[PDB]
Design a protein around this ligand. Structure first.
Ligand SMILES: O=C(Nc1cccc(-c2nn[nH]n2)c1)c1cc(C(F)(F)F)cc2[nH]cnc12
Ligand SMILES: O=C(Nc1cccc(-c2nn[nH]n2)c1)c1cc(C(F)(F)F)cc2[nH]cnc12
Length: 263
C-alpha cells in the first residue's frame, strides 16, 4: 500500500529532483513509517554515531578508555577539523574526540574513533554485534563522503539506521551510563537546526547527527522527545543526481514536517 504520508513524501521528492529516504519509528506503539526504507543511501557523517557508540561499548569494559590521552599530529588533519586542529601536537581524550565528532562533525575526530576500532570494518563489526546487518563502513574521512550513486560503500538503509538509533539511544545496545552519554552528546549537537528539527514543533526536544557529501547528499538522524508523546526516531536521507549538487537541508525539514503532521 501507499499511505497519505508516503504520497506526500513522494510529492516532496518529485519536486526536489533527488532521491529521499525516510524511516520513522514511533516508540509509543513501535509503528514504522518508511519511504524508500530499504534502499541504500550514503551515510556521510551520520556514520559518526555508530563510531562513537562503538567506542562507548568498548568503554563498558574499560572505565578509563574515555580519559586516556590520544596524540593529535599535523598530518592527522583532514578537511574539516574545527576542534582537532586546536590540539595538533597535543592530545585529546576519546571522550573529547567523540564529542567533537558528534557535536561539531569534526572529521579528524571521527578518524581517531575509527582507528581506535581498528579501521572502518571495526565500526561495521559493532553494528553487526547490535543486530544491524545492513550498515557498512568501508573508508575513513573524508573519502567516505564521496556519495557516488550506486556505490555500496559507506551506506545503510533508512530502516536499518532508525532501528539501530533506537537501540542505541532508547534501548539496551549500550549500558545505561553509555546510552545516557550518547543522548547527552546528540542533544548538544551544534549542526542540526536547519534539518529535521526545522520541520518539527518547537516544543519538541531533538538530539541529532547531520551529514552531507558529494551529489548534494544531505542527511540527518534524530531521536525526538515530542511534547505529550513517547519518543520518536527519525532518519531522513537525501541524495541528488549531479556530483556538484547543492545541499538541501530544507528537504529534510519538509520530510520531518510531513511525518509530524501524519502522527
Ligand atoms: O563542513 C561542511 N562541509 C564540508 C567540509 C569539508 C569539505 C567539504 C567539501 N569538499 N568538497 N566539497 N565540499 C564540505 C558542512 C556542510 C553542511 C551542508 F550545509 F549540509 F552542506 C553542513 C555542515 N554543518 C557542519 N559542517 C557542514
Ligand atoms: O567531508 C566532507 N563533508 C563534510 C565534512 C565534515 C562535516 C560534514 C557535515 N556534517 N554535517 N553535515 N555535513 C560534511 C566532504 C568530502 C568529500 C570527499 F570528496 F569525499 F572527500 C566531498 C564532499 N562534498 C561535500 N562534502 C564533502
Amino acid at each position: 500500500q501507499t499511505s497519505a504520508v508516503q504520497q506526500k513524501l513522494a510529492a516532496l521528492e518529485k519536486s526536489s529532483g533527488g532521491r529521499l529516504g525516510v524511516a520513522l519509528i514511533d516508540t509509543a506503539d513501535n509503528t514504522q513509517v518508511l519511504y524508500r526504507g530499504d534502499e541504500r543511501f550514503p551515510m556521510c557523517s551520520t556514520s559518526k554515531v555508530m563510531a562513537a557508540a562503538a567506542v562507548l561499548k568498548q568503554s563498558e569494559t574499560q572505565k578509563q578508555l574515555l580519559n586516556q590521552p590520544v596524540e593529535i599530529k599535523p598530518a592527522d588533519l583532514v578537511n574539516y577539523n574545527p576542534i582537532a586542529e586546536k590540539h595538533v601536537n597535543g592530545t585529546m581524550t576519546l571522550a573529547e574526540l567523540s564529542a567533537a565528532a558528534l557535536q561539531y562533525s569534526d572529521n579528524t575526530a571521527m578518524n581517531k574513533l575509527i582507528a581506535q576500532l581498528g579501521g572502518p570494518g571495526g565500526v561495521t563489526a559493532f553494528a553487526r554485534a547490535i543486530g544491524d546487518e545492513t550498515f557498512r563502513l568501508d573508508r575513513t574521512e573524508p573519502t567516505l563522503n564521496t556519495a557516488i550513486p550506486g556505490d555500496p560503500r559507506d551506506t545503510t538503509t533508512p530502516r536499518a539506521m532508525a532501528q539501530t538509533l533506537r537501540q542505541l539511544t532508547l534501548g539496551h545496545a549500550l549500558g545505561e551510563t553509555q546510552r545516557a552519554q550518547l543522548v547527552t552528546w546528540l542533544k548538544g549537537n551544534t549542526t542540526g537546526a536547519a534539518s529535521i528539527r526545522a520541520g518539527l514543533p518547537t516544543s519538541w526536544t531533538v538530539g541529532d547527527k547531520t551529514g552531507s557529501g558529494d551529489y548534494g547528499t544531505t542527511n540527518d538522524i534524530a531521536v525526538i522527545w515530542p511534547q505529550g508523546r513517547a519518543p520518536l526516531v527519525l532518519v531522513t536521507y537525501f541524495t541528488q543526481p549531479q556530483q556538484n549538487a547543492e545541499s538541501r537541508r530544507d528537504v529534510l525539514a519538509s520530510a520531518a514536517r510531513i511525518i509530524a503532521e501524519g502522527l
